[PDB]
Amino acid sequence: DPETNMNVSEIISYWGFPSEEYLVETEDGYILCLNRIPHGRPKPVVFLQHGLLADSSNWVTNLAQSSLGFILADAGFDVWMGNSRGNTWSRKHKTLSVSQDEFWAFSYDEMAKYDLPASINFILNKTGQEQVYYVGHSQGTTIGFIAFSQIPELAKRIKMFFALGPVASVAFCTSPMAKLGRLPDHLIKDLFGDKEFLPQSAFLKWLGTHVCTHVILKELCGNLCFLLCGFNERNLNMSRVDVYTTHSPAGTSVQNMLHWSQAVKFQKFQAFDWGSSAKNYFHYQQSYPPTYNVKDMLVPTAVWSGGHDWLADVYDVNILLTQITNLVFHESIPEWEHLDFIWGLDAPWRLYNKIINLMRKYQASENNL
Ligand SMILES: *[C@@H]1O[C@H](CO)[C@@H](O[C@@H]2O[C@H](CO)[C@@H](O)[C@H](O)[C@H]2NC(C)=O)[C@H](O)[C@H]1NC(C)=O
Ligand SMILES: *[C@@H]1O[C@H](CO)[C@@H](O)[C@H](O)[C@H]1NC(C)=O
């Protein structure tokens, strides 16, 4: 497969689409790579945000008529895809080197606080548009829930929020992440260091111990993304595995994994606990981390969840839906697993078509004013 050892711009150009990349600088000096599909093979803007240990690839890794990024371009949208700090394409800084611990001293807190405002405000300036549609998967969902409840000036800029496999609280997840999560913070630091989260073969074998055993592929259990997220074999293109395997995982910090462990352990949707009153005060101007309330998020939201989703589990998803003021739509696809939202064979007709039609319903209402 030519897409395996290709960059995200090369994949877009391979499928016959216009490709554009942009370097954006955050308020805290990180240099993010934005991917753009300006037209199909001024238009309304859609911003696609990847999840845990992923990248822009996620929206352009199936075929031209089965990948969200590509179908949105063909449906008449100006497609923008974000890359979270620390991944393959966003591992540059104005001052810091990738060899310094301070470079990796971030979690999804900084992604929501600095990556999203910088990325969205760059787009709105470039296009001249006043608003964007926001689509998030997995961790991209939580970045949205934080950014849009914490930054009301940014929320105003969002027409509609499409949450695919939504994650706020991760209190009841049964994914191998709750296993890594329930280890003490000092042990995670001891095993993986203070920089990039790079687990070796022995750790992934331990994380995989009798949880990834009623699977045909099994090579998928060696992959960090497939392991933490979970895959539905009834709905994956098992011939495309090497494309998914090469592009994912795409990189994150040990601190981001520490934050996800704190989310499992404390069962609270909050900012990162730095370990002491003094350390927290140095970051938040208070001794305990600020809590994030989904009730403060007034953006019109459309939610898709999977009944067999390990990470964005049924129990946590049901709690979340009761907290979304202005829930426009919600659907639970009973057999879907976490990765089905981005790589499901049936995702174009059970998901991608509904997203396009809700955007058009919003457009019809807009054009009516
Ligand atoms: C499922 O995966 C296979 C393998 O990635 C896809 O087949 C490739 O499709 C492209 C575009 O049509 C061709 O250029 C390749 O030569 C095909 N073969 C291989 C082995 O890469 C297939 O189209 C995917 N999609 C579905 C829905 O089956
Ligand atoms: C992607 O590959 C193309 C072609 O080699 C190159 O021009 C571009 O700068 C690359 N982008 C990144 C982010 O590596």
Residue numbers in the entry: 9 to 49, 57 to 384
Show passages lifted from the paper.
The overall architecture consists of a core domain and a cap domain. The core domain, which constitutes residues 9–183 and 310–384 (mature protein numbering), contains a central β-sheet composed of eight strands (seven parallel) and six helices, three on each side of the β-sheet. The cap domain fold (residues 184–309) is a complex mixture of eight helices, turns, and random coils, including a lid (residues 215–244) that adapts a “closed” conformation. Among these, Cys-227 and Cys-236 (mature protein numbering) form a disulfide bridge (Cys-227–Cys-236), whereas the other Cys residues are free, as previously discussed in the case of HGL. As suggested before, Pro-241 and Gly-245 residues flank the lid acting as hinges, with the trans-cis-proline isomerization inducing opening and closing of the lid. In our HLAL structure, His-274 in the α13 helix is involved in a hydrogen bond interaction with Ser-122 and Gln-285, is sandwiched by two aromatic residues (Tyr-123 and Phe-287), and stabilizes the interaction between the α13 helix and a long loop-helix-loop region (residues 286–304).
Lysosomal acid lipase (LAL) is a serine hydrolase enzyme located in the lysosome, where it breaks down cholesteryl esters (CEs) and TGs into free cholesterol and fatty acids (1–3). LAL belongs to a gene family of mammalian acid lipases that includes gastric and lingual lipases. LAL deficiency in humans results in multisystem autosomal recessive disease phenotypes, WD and CESD.
